[PDB]
Scaffold this active site. Structure first.
Site, mmCIF file in Angstrom:
data_model
loop_
_atom_site.group_PDB
_atom_site.id
_atom_site.type_symbol
_atom_site.label_atom_id
_atom_site.label_comp_id
_atom_site.label_asym_id
_atom_site.label_seq_id
_atom_site.Cartn_x
_atom_site.Cartn_y
_atom_site.Cartn_z
ATOM 1 C CB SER A 95 -0.920 -0.092 1.305
ATOM 2 O OG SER A 95 -2.154 0.272 1.068
ATOM 3 C CG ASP A 218 -7.346 -3.426 -3.633
ATOM 4 O OD1 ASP A 218 -7.834 -2.395 -2.955
ATOM 5 O OD2 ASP A 218 -6.174 -3.790 -3.610
ATOM 6 C CG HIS A 246 -5.429 -2.572 -0.013
ATOM 7 N ND1 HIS A 246 -4.919 -2.594 -1.418
ATOM 8 C CD2 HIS A 246 -4.728 -1.598 0.445
ATOM 9 C CE1 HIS A 246 -4.163 -1.644 -1.404
ATOM 10 N NE2 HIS A 246 -3.940 -1.000 -0.261
#
Length: 268
Positions: A95, A218, A246
């Site tokens: 991320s 996602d 995610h």
């Protein structure tokens, strides 16, 4: 500060052995601990590097100013590379960690051999017709508000959004727990830095090879963003994971370990 202090502040730990090193960076609301199911699998052949953002890597101990933008986070990454006295390292980030890794490589590209990005996003804003972040300015502003007005309620709401897997509660409770354990003021500063950042223009400056692991279903980082990054990142490869949501490193460690391992075995 000096070596020992950087090592203290970012809870730097080194494991394994190898000619090359792989540095793992946590995504939002997480500490090195999110890497427990993936990172040890690389200790056999690489020196493995774990660390927390002083900008509260879901933990305590800091300067207000430096963590208002992701650059402060990229500065931590650089600082650790410096304390470890590294010449080069593979960088695995999740991320925001991926982007954070990206920004740091633009500052010191010679420091990174590769950029493995698990679930990256260069911008969360939806921008029709050319870009779909997955969020409307107001939705982001909606979560930031929820985060202040009521933090803990947010921790659970967001843990569900990030996993987007209703029948995988153990992971969700762990994610929710990680979010709850993170200082709420810094959590909010961090989130603002992440949610409102836009790094599309920076993609073209990346000179370090990157592997983009795009997740399936996602909501945080839809397929749009993975493709878009592949299109604009000068040197990259895009692998679609079967894993949903995610946080593949938490929900699907194995597929994560394979993709990452293949990619490296290949580019030696």
């Amino acid at each position: 500060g000096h070596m020992t202090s950087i090592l203290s502040r970012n809870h730097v730990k080194v494991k394994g052995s190898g000619k090359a090193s792989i540095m793992f960076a946590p995504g939002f609301g997480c500490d090195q601990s999110v890497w427990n199911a993936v990172a040890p699998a690389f200790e056999e052949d690489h020196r493995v590097i774990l660390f927390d953002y002083v900008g509260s890597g879901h933990s305590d101990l800091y300067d207000l100013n430096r963590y208002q933008t992701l650059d402060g986070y990229a500065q931590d990454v650089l600082d650790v590379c410096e304390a470890l006295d590294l010449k080069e390292t593979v960088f695995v980030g999740h991320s925001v960690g991926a982007l954070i890794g990206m920004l740091a490589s633009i500052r010191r590209p010679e420091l990174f051999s590769h950029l493995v990005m698990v679930g990256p996003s260069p911008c969360y804003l939806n921008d029709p017709p050319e870009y779909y972040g997955g969020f409307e300015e107001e939705q982001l502003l909606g979560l930031l508000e929820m985060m202040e007005k009521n933090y803990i309620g947010w921790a659970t709401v967001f843990a569900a959004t990030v996993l987007n897997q209703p029948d995988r509660p153990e992971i969700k409770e762990e994610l929710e727990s990680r979010f709850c354990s993170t200082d709420p003021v810094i959590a909010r500063q961090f989130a603002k830095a992440a949610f409102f950042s836009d790094h599309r223009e920076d993609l073209s400056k990346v000179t370090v090879p990157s592997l983009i692991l795009q997740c399936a279903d996602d909501i945080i980082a839809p397929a749009t963003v993975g493709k878009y990054m592949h299109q604009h990142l000068p040197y990259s490869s895009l692998k679609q994971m079967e894993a949903r949501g995610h946080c593949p490193h938490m929900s699907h460690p194995d597929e994560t370990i394979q993709l990452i391992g293949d990619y490296l075995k290949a580019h030696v």
